[PDB]
């Protein structure tokens, strides 16, 4: 019947000196929470190691594809250069008087 008063428990205090205190937990409640947190953190760690390893494998794959795409472009231009070098050598060889 005092629910309207109890609603004010969590109303922000005007005093900055008023500090919230977490409701007391028994050793049994605290031990369960800690054990539960251990399991959750172990899951998160196992997952994040997998991710790091994948990102690492992906870095290696993307770099290899990058180097290979570059080498193709460099090869194209070198082939273009040799063609122009041969053109000039063909021009010197034939004699357009």
């Amino acid at each position: 019947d005092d629910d309207d008063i109890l609603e004010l428990v969590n109303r922000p205090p005007m005093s900055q000196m008023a500090v919230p205190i977490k409701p007391p937990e028994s050793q049994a409640e605290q031990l369960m929470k800690a054990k539960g947190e251990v399991g959750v953190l172990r899951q998160k760690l196992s997952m994040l190691e997998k991710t790091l390893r994948e990102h690492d494998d992906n870095q290696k794959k993307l770099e290899s594809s990058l180097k290979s795409s570059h080498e193709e472009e460099v090869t194209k231009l070198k082939i273009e250069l040799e063609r122009l070098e041969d053109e000039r050598k063909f021009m010197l060889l034939e004699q357009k008087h």
Partner: protein, 120 residues
């Protein structure tokens, strides 16, 4: 020893409403629902909602009827259809443990203000 009639001053005097601290009160009745207590000023008895450090302190210390406290951090509050007056206590200090009741025939503050509503 108690701040006689202070609960009335808290809701009628603006300077007192703006800062309802320093009052010396006696625990009148006990038992989140556990954090709602009855306090006495020697003339009036009113409800007190313990919050923050005061809710922790009161529960660990197992304060009961007869104990004397000094309110350090408090807020006044008038909640349901003005029939409900409460003092939100965020911090207090123990003055005396299990003292004899200063008054047992005190007036409920909400009952007083229902009879005198023009002064709030």
């Amino acid at each position: 020893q108690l701040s006689r009639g202070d609960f009335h001053s808290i809701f009628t005097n603006k300077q007192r409403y703006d800062n309802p601290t320093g009052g010396v009160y006696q625990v009148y009745n006990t038992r989140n629902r556990e954090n709602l207590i009855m306090i006495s000023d020697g003339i009036y008895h009113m409800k007190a909602l313990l919050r923050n450090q005061a809710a922790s302190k009161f529960q660990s210390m197992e304060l009961q009827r007869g104990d004397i406290i000094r309110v350090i951090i408090a807020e006044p509050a008038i909640v349901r259809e003005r029939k409900k007056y409460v003092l939100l206590v965020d911090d207090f200090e123990l003055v005396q443990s299990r003292a004899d009741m200063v008054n047992q025939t005190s007036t409920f503050l909400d009952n007083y203000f229902s009879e005198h509503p023009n002064e709030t």
